[PDB]
Amino acid sequence: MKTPLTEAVSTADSQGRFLSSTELQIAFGRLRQANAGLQAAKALTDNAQSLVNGAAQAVYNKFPYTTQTQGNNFAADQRGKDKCARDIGYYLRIVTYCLVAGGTGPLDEYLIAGIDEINRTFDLSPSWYVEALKYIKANHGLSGDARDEANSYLDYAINALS
Amino acid sequence: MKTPLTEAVSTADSQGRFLSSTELQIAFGRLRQANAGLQAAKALTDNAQSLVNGAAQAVYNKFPYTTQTQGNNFAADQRGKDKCARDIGYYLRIVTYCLVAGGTGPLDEYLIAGIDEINRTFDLSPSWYVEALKYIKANHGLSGDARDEANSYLDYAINALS
Amino acid sequence: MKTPLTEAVSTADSQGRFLSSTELQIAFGRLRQANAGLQAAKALTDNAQSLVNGAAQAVYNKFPYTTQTQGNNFAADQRGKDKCARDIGYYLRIVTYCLVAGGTGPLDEYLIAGIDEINRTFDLSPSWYVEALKYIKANHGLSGDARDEANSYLDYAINALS
Amino acid sequence: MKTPLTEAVSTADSQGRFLSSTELQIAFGRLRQANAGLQAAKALTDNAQSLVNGAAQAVYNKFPYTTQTQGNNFAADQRGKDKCARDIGYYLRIVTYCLVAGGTGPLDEYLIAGIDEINRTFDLSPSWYVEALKYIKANHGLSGDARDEANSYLDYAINALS
Amino acid sequence: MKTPLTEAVSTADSQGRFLSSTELQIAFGRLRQANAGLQAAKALTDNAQSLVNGAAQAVYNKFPYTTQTQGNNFAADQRGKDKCARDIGYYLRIVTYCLVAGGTGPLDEYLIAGIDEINRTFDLSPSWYVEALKYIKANHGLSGDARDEANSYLDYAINALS
Amino acid sequence: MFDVFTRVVSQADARGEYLSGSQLDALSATVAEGNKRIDSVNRITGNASAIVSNAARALFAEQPQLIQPGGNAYTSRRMAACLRDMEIILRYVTYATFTGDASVLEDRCLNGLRETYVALGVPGASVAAGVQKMKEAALDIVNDPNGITRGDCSAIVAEIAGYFDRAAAAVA
Amino acid sequence: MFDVFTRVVSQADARGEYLSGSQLDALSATVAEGNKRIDSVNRITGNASAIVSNAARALFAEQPQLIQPGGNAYTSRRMAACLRDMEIILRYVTYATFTGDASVLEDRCLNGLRETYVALGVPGASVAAGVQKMKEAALDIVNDPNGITRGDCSAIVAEIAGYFDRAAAAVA
Amino acid sequence: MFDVFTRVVSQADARGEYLSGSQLDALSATVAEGNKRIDSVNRITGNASAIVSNAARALFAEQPQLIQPGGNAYTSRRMAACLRDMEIILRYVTYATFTGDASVLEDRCLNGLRETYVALGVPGASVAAGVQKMKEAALDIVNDPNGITRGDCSAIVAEIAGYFDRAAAAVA
Amino acid sequence: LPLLNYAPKSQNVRVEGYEIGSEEKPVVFTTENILSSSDMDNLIEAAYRQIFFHAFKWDREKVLESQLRNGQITVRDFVRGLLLSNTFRNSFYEKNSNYRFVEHCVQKILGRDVYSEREKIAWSIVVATKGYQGLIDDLLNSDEYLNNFGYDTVPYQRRRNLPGREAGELPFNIKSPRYDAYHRRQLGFPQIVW
C-alpha cells in the first residue's frame, strides 16, 4: 500500500541501501501528518451515515433520470438505491483508510485500480460518483491539515474518474 | 543525488503519477529538518579549520607510523601532511553539503563512489579516515537534530569505509 | 489497419516467408466479401443524413436529459447538438470505411483506440453512442452479407463502448 | 501448422482480440478452397502408387548414376531403390496433407524442417527430389483449383530444396 | 577457470564448435609450460614453512605497528600472528595451485574474488599482503620458466591488491 | 494449435497413411457446416460484452458472498480481474469454435488455470458457475432464428456447449 | 502498411468524406481483377528460387567484377548475403502485388536500404541491375499463357513492373 | 508491503468496516512512539558495519569449521557472500523496524530463504546463529542511554528483537 | 532447426493487470531520463542486481559501465554485456545444467518464470547449436523482451505482487540461487556442523 513509510523502504530497497537521513525525514513527515489524518478518519467515520445518505441524495437530485429510468444500472427500485448507497459508502470508507495510511494506497488498491472497467462494463456513469465525492468534500466540515489531506484524497478519486 | 525532494519526484515519475499526499509529507519532513541542517552546516563551516586540524592530529596520534614512515602515501613530510589535511577537509566540506541538501547525495556523488579505488590505488588506509571522522563526530559540538543528522552522514562515510 | 490483406502479409513477413496458399485463400475470402461490402458502403453513404439525424434523435429520446441539461458535454444548445451529430457521423463514416476495407482496421485506427480516454475526459457517456449505433443497425435497411458485415462493425463498436 | 484457420486465431490471440470480420473472411476463403483440396487429395491418393513409381523412374532416368553407382546414398541395389521410393512416397503423402489442411503446415512440420541437414548428412542430392516433384506436377492430372493448390505445395517443396 | 585447457573448451563450447587446431595449439602451449610449473610447485611446497615464516616476519618488520597495536585486525597477540601466518600460507598454497593448473584460475576462484570485501570488512591492509608476496618473490629461488610463471602469479596477486 | 483439418492430418501422419475415403468425406461434411460455424462465431462475438456482463451480474446475484467485503470479487481490481477472466474464457471458446478443435482453448487458456486459481484463492467452482451462465446465454444467441437463413445448427451448438463444458470442468 | 482498399480509405478519412460513388466503382473494378492478382502472386512465388538464381547468374556473368576476389559478392558469406537480398526484394515485391499497394515495399524493404548499402559498400547500381533481371524473369512468368484461364493481365503486369522499378530506384 | 498503519487498514477492508475508536487510538499511540522508532532505525544503521563484522567474527570463533578449508565460509568469495548475507538480513530488519510491520522482511528477504540455503548447501542453522549475534549487538546499540533524550524504548526494542527472531527462525 | 514447440501456462504476466503505481511496482531505471552520475550508479546497481543478484568488486564491469554512461551502448546492450560476462558464465552457466541455465535466463532477462519443463527443454539446446551468444541474442531480441523493457530500461521481475496481498511470488534471486543441488553435491555441501 502506497504510503510514506512503504515508499521510503521501496526507494532504499531498489538501491540496495540501508535507510538514511532522507528516509528518516520521510518518517518525520509521516509523523507530522498522522494525528490529523487519524482525527479526520474519526470525524468522517462518526458522520458516515449522513455523508453517505446526503451524498446519494445529491446524486439523485443532480441526475434525476437515475431514480426514474428502469434498468439494472439505475436506482429506480430499492435494489438500485441500495447498490448506489453501498458504492458511495465504499468511497467514503476507503477514503478514511487513506487518511489512516497517509497515502492513496487504500484508494489505489481497493477502489481506483480497475474502476474504469467496472463503470464501462456495468454502464455506471463516473459523473455520478464525482458528484457524490463533491458532496462529501463540501460536507465533511474538516479544517486545517485534516481538511487538506482529506480533500487531496477526494480530489484524487475525482481526478481518476475524469 | 539522493535528497527527500528528488527521491519523492523520482518515485512519482517512475510511477507516471502526479505528486500525492505521500510526496507532500516527504516535503514536510524535509522542511522539518532543513533549518537544523542549515544551522549544522554553518556551525561546521565556521569551525572547519579547527575540526580539520584536530582530526588530522587525531589520525597522526592513533597512527604514529603515518608521520614517521617515508613514502608517497604517508604524511612524514609537509607534502603528505598537506594531502592529509586536504582530504579531511574534503570529507568535512561534503558532509556540510549533505546537511544543506538533506541527504547523502553529495557524499554519494562527490566522495563515496570511487573512494575504494582511490584508497587501494594510492595505498591509503580507510582506517585513517575513519579515525578522522570519529574525531569530527566527537568535536563538532552540535546538539539535537543538527547533531543527529550530522552524525548520520559522518557514520554513513565511516560505514562506507568499513 | 486490420484487413484480411495486410494481416496476411504482416503474418508472412513476421515469419520471413513468401505468401503461400494460406494467404491466397485469405485473398479469396476478401474477394468473396468485397462487393457486398462496397454495396453496403454505398447504401449507408446515400442514407447518411437520415441515419445520422435519426440516430441523434433516437439518442435524445432515450436520454432526454442530454437536450435539457446545461453543460459542455450535453446537447442542450445548438453547439452541443452539432458536436453530437458530428460524432455520430464519425461512427457512420468510419463504419463505411470498415466495409470498404473489409476489417475493423479503420474503426481501430480512427475511432476505437483511445475512445475510452476521450469519453472519460469530456464526460461523454458511452451509452449515448451505443444507442445511436443500435439505431443505425435497425434502420440501415441492409440484408444478406452486407447486413452481416455492417452489423459486425456496428456490434464491434458497441462492444468497445460497453 | 500454418493453415488459414490456425493463422487467423494465432493472429487474433497475439493481439488478445476476439475474431472479427477479417478472420471470418479467412474462414470463408478456407471454405471456398476446401472441397477442391479434398478432391485433389483423393485423386493424388488414388493414383499414389502410380505417381511414386513414375516419379522415381523419372529420377532414375535423369540421374542414371544413381542406379549404377554403389554407395549407401545411391539406388544401385534394391535397398537403395526402396529408400528412394519411400522418400518420394513421403513427399506425395505429405503434400496430400497440405491439400487437406489448406496450407503448407504439414510440409513445414513433417518434411521441410530439417531436410537440409538430412540431405547433407546422408549425401542425398536435392535435385533428385526436385525431379520427382516436377514429374508429379506433370502427371497428377488435376485441373482448376485442385491443380493450382496442389502445384503450389509441390512448388513450395521444390523452392525449399533449391 | 582461467586455465589454458579449460578456456579452450569453454570458448569452443560457447561457440558450439568442435575443437580445432587453435585449441590444439593452446594445448601444446600448456604442455610446454606444465613441467616447469609442476617443478615450481614442488620447490615452493618443499620450502613452504620457511617462505611463510619469512614472509610474515618481513611484514612485521615493514609494519612494526602490526605486532604492537591491540586490535582484532593486528598481530600483537598469538591469535593474530596465527591468523597472519595462516593468511600468508593461503596465498602461497593457492599460488602453487596456479602453477599446477597453468593459470590464475585457482587464485581467482579461491582468493581474489571477494578479497576486496574481506580486507575492507576486517580492516586488513592490502599492503601487508603485498609485502609478504614480494618476500616470496625474492626468496623462492626459482629460475627460468618456473621463476617466470611463479612470478607472474605472485605479481598477479600484487596487482590485484594495488 | 490444431484445427479440425490438422487434427486429422496429424493422426494420419503418425500412422504413415493417406486420409481414407471416409476421413475425407467427414471433412467434406465439416466444410458443409462451415457457414453455420462462421455464423455462430460471429453471433457470440457480436454479443460478447452482454454475455459476460449478464453472466457476471447473475453470478453475483446468486452468489452474493463473492462481492461482499472480503469476498473474492470484492474491490475494483478483483472485480475487474474476474470480468477479465470471463471475457478471456469466452474469447478462447470462440477460438476453438472457429478452428473446430479444442487445442487452442486447452493449451492457451485452460493449461495451468486451476493451479493459478488454487494459488490465488479464486473460487474455481464459482468460476465454473460463471462459465455455465455464459454458455447458456451464448447458445441462445447462436440459436436465435431471427435475421438469419433458417437451418439446423444443432451439431454446432453441441460442439460449442462442449467447449464451454470443457472450460468449466478445468477450473472447477 | 496499406492495401489498395485502405489506401483509398485513408485518403477519404483525411478529408472527412465518404468514398464517392466513383471511388467505390474503382475499388469494385479492383475486386474484379483480384483473381489475376492472386494468380500473379502465385506464379512469382512458385518460381521464386529460379527467378533469384537465374537473375543472380545473369548479373554475375555480366559483372564479373562482383565475384572476383575482392569483389563485393566474393566469399561465401557475401555471396549468400547477396542472394538473400535478391530474394528479400522479390518477396516484398510480391507483398506489394498481393496488397495492391507499394506501402509494404517502401516501409519494410526499402526503408533505409540505400543508406545500408552505402554504409556497407554494396554497389547499389549492381543491385538495381539484379532487380531488373528478376523483373524481366517475373513478368514473363506472370504473362505465361499456358496452364491458366486466358485473359488480359496487362493491368497487373504493369503494376508489378512498377513495384520492381520502385525497388531498383531505391537501391541507387 | 504493509506498514504498521496499513496492516490495520487491510484487516478493516477485509471486514468492510471503518476503523474503530480503539484502533484509531492504538495508531495514535504508535505515532507517539514514532521518534523512538526512528532513533532505533538510525542507531542500527549507523553501526551496521560493526554489527555485521563483530557478529561474523564471533560466529567464526564459535564455529571454526565454517572457515577451515572446505568449509562453507572458506575462500574469499564464500566469506564475502556470508558477510553480504548478514548485512542483507540486518538491512531488511531495519526496514521492518522502520515500517513497523514484518511484511517487507518476509516478502523480500525471508520467504523462501530456507530453500535458498538448502539448495546452496549453506548451513542455515549457522546463519541463524549469526543472526542472533547481530540481534544481541543491535539491541545493545538501540538501548545505549548515552547521547539521546532519555526515555523508555522497551516496546520498540521488543519489536526489533522479534524481527531478528523471525529472521533467525526463517533461515533454518 | 526451429525451436521445439511448447504451450504457455496461465501467468500473471499473461493478463491485463490494471496496474497503478505503488511501492510494489518495479522501479523503472531508464536512460531516457537524463540520469546524473549518482542516478546512473543506481541504474547500474539495479542491472547488477537483476542479472547477478550481487556484484562483488571482482564481478563488476567498469568498462561496460563507462560505455553505458557515455551513451555508446543502450541498457539492453549493457544487459547483454553482463550476460556475456565472466561472472554470469561462471556463476549461472557452468554451475548448472543447460535446463536450469535456461530458467535463469528467462527469469533474469524476460522477468517471468518458465512455462514448464518443456520450455526449458526446448531452449536448452540453443547454446549448443547457436552458441552461447545466440541464446542471449534470441532472448534480448524477442518480442517479449522488447515489448516490456525496450532498449533503455533495466529488466525486472514482472507482476510479482497483486494489490492488497501481503506477499507476492518469490523473488527470483531467492527462488533461483546461482547454483542448486547438482553443484552443491560437487562442493561437498551441506556441511555437518556441531
Ligand SMILES: *[C@@H](C)[C@H]1/C(=C/c2[nH]c(/C=C3N=C(/C=C4\NC(=O)C(CC)=C4C)C(C)=C\3CCC(=O)O)c(CCC(=O)O)c2C)NC(=O)[C@@H]1C
Ligand atoms: C445457426 C448458427 C443459425 C443459422 C445459420 C446459418 N447460416 C446460413 C448461411 C449463411 N450464413 C452466412 C454468414 C455470413 N455472411 C457474411 O457475409 C458474414 C459476415 C462476414 C457472415 C457471418 C453466409 C455467407 C451464408 C450463406 C448464404 C446464406 O445466407 O444462406 C445457413 C444456411 C446453411 C448454410 O450451410 O449456409 C444457416 C443454417 N441458421 C439458423 O436458423 C440458426 C439460428
Ligand SMILES: *[C@@H](C)[C@H]1/C(=C/c2[nH]c(/C=C3N=C(/C=C4\NC(=O)C(CC)=C4C)C(C)=C\3CCC(=O)O)c(CCC(=O)O)c2C)NC(=O)[C@@H]1C
Ligand atoms: C495473368 C495473371 C494470367 C491469367 C490469369 C487469370 N486467372 C484467371 C482466373 C482464375 N485464377 C484463379 C486462381 C486460383 N485458384 C485457386 O484455387 C488458386 C490456388 C489456391 C489460385 C491461384 C481462379 C480461382 C480463377 C477463377 C476461376 C477460373 O478457373 O478461371 C483469369 C480469368 C479471369 C477471372 O478471374 O474470371 C485470368 C485472366 N490469365 C492469362 O492469360 C495470364 C497469363
Ligand SMILES: *[C@H](C)[C@H]1/C(=C/c2[nH]c(/C=C3N=C(/C=C4\NC(=O)C(CC)=C4C)C(C)=C\3CCC(=O)O)c(CCC(=O)O)c2C)NC(=O)[C@@H]1C
Ligand atoms: C450510485 C452513485 C449510482 C448507482 C450504482 C450502482 N452500482 C452498481 C453496481 C456495482 N457497483 C460497483 C462498485 C464497486 N464495487 C467495489 O468492489 C468497489 C470498490 C471497493 C466499488 C466502487 C460494482 C463493482 C458493481 C457491480 C457488481 C455489484 O453489483 O456489486 C449498480 C447495479 C449494476 C448492475 O448491473 O447490477 C448500481 C445501480 N446507480 C445509480 O443510478 C446511482 C446514481
Ligand SMILES: *[C@H](C)[C@H]1/C(=C/c2[nH]c(/C=C3N=C(/C=C4\NC(=O)C(CC)=C4C)C(C)=C\3CCC(=O)O)c(CCC(=O)O)c2C)NC(=O)[C@@H]1C
Ligand atoms: C530508544 C531506543 C532510545 C531513546 C529514544 C528517544 N528519542 C526521543 C526523541 C527524539 N529523537 C529524535 C530523533 C532525531 N531527530 C532528528 O533530527 C533525527 C535525524 C534525522 C533523528 C534521528 C527526535 C526528533 C526526537 C524528539 C525531540 C527530542 O530531541 O527529544 C525520545 C523522547 C520521546 C519522544 O518521543 O520524543 C526518546 C526516548 N531514548 C532512550 O533513552 C533510548 C536509549
Ligand SMILES: *[C@H](C)[C@H]1/C(=C/c2[nH]c(/C=C3N=C(/C=C4\NC(=O)C(CC)=C4C)C(C)=C\3CCC(=O)O)c(CCC(=O)O)c2C)NC(=O)[C@@H]1C
Ligand atoms: C530417391 C529420390 C533417391 C535416394 C534416396 C535415399 N534416401 C535415403 C535415406 C533417407 N531418406 C530420408 C528422408 C526422409 N525421412 C523422413 O522422415 C522424411 C520426411 C517425412 C524424409 C524426406 C532419410 C531421413 C534418410 C536417412 C535415414 C533413413 O534410413 O531413413 C537413402 C539411403 C541413404 C543411406 O546412406 O542409407 C537413399 C538411397 N537415393 C537415390 O539414389 C535416389 C535417386
Ligand SMILES: *[C@H](C)[C@H]1/C(=C/c2[nH]c(/C=C3N=C(/C=C4\NC(=O)C(CC)=C4C)C(C)=C\3CCC(=O)O)c(CCC(=O)O)c2C)NC(=O)[C@@H]1C
Ligand atoms: C598478516 C599478513 C596480517 C594479519 C592477518 C589477519 N587476518 C585475519 C583474518 C582473516 N584473514 C582472512 C583471509 C582469507 N580467508 C580466506 O578464506 C582466504 C582465501 C583462501 C583468505 C586470504 C579472512 C577471510 C579473515 C577473517 C575471517 C577469519 O578470521 O578467518 C586476522 C584477524 C581479523 C579479525 O578481526 O579477527 C588477522 C590478524 N593481521 C596482521 O596484523 C598481519 C600483518
Ligand SMILES: *[C@H](C)[C@H]1/C(=C/c2[nH]c(/C=C3N=C(/C=C4\NC(=O)C(CC)=C4C)C(C)=C\3CCC(=O)O)c(CCC(=O)O)c2C)NC(=O)[C@@H]1C
Ligand atoms: C567443381 C568441383 C564442380 C563445379 C563447380 C561450379 N561452381 C559454380 C559456381 C559457383 N561456385 C561458387 C563457389 C565459391 N564462391 C566463393 O566466393 C567461394 C568462397 C571464397 C566459393 C567456394 C559460387 C559462389 C558460385 C556461384 C557464383 C559464381 O559462379 O561465381 C559453377 C557454375 C554454376 C552456375 O550455375 O553458374 C560451377 C560449374 N561444377 C561441376 O560440375 C564440378 C564437378
Ligand SMILES: *[C@H](C)[C@H]1/C(=C/c2[nH]c(/C=C3N=C(/C=C4\NC(=O)C(CC)=C4C)C(C)=C\3CCC(=O)O)c(CCC(=O)O)c2C)NC(=O)[C@@H]1C
Ligand atoms: C546482391 C545482388 C548484391 C550484394 C548484396 C549484399 N548485401 C549485404 C548485406 C546486407 N544486405 C542487407 C539488406 C537487407 N536486410 C534486411 O533485413 C532487408 C529487409 C528489410 C534488406 C533489404 C543488410 C541489412 C545487410 C547487412 C546485414 C547482413 O547480415 O548482411 C552483403 C554483405 C556485405 C558484407 O558482408 O560486408 C552483400 C554482399 N552484393 C553485391 O555485390 C550485389 C550487387
Ligand SMILES: *[C@H](C)[C@H]1/C(=C/c2[nH]c(/C=C3N=C(/C=C4\NC(=O)C(CC)=C4C)C(C)=C\3CCC(=O)O)c(CCC(=O)O)c2C)NC(=O)[C@@H]1C
Ligand atoms: C554467513 C553468516 C553464512 C553463509 C552465507 C552464504 N550465502 C551464500 C550465498 C547466497 N546467499 C543468497 C541470499 C539471498 N538472495 C536473496 O535474494 C536474498 C534476499 C534479498 C538473500 C538473503 C544467495 C541468493 C546466494 C547465492 C548467490 C550469491 O552468492 O551471490 C554463500 C555462498 C554460496 C555460493 O557460492 O553461491 C554463503 C557462504 N555461509 C556460511 O557458512 C555462513 C553460516
Ligand SMILES: *[C@H](C)[C@H]1/C(=C/c2[nH]c(/C=C3N=C(/C=C4\NC(=O)C(CC)=C4C)C(C)=C\3CCC(=O)O)c(CCC(=O)O)c2C)NC(=O)[C@@H]1C
Ligand atoms: C470471475 C468469474 C471469478 C474471479 C476471478 C479472478 N481471477 C483473478 C486473477 C487471475 N486470473 C488469472 C487468469 C489467467 N491467466 C492466464 O494466463 C489466463 C489465460 C490467458 C487466464 C484465464 C490470473 C493469471 C490472475 C492473476 C493476475 C491478475 O489477477 O491480474 C482474480 C484476482 C485475484 C486477486 O487476488 O487479485 C479474480 C478476482 N474471482 C471470483 O470471485 C469469480 C468466481
Ligand SMILES: *[C@H](C)[C@H]1/C(=C/c2[nH]c(/C=C3N=C(/C=C4\NC(=O)C(CC)=C4C)C(C)=C\3CCC(=O)O)c(CCC(=O)O)c2C)NC(=O)[C@@H]1C
Ligand atoms: C586521467 C589520466 C584523465 C581523466 C580521465 C577521465 N575520463 C573520464 C571519462 C571517460 N573516460 C572514458 C574512456 C573510455 N571508456 C571506454 O570504454 C574506453 C575504451 C575501452 C575508454 C578509453 C569514457 C568513455 C568516459 C565517459 C564515461 C565514463 O564516465 O566512464 C572522466 C570522467 C569525466 C566525467 O565524469 O564526466 C575522467 C576524469 N581526467 C583527467 O583530468 C585526466 C587527465
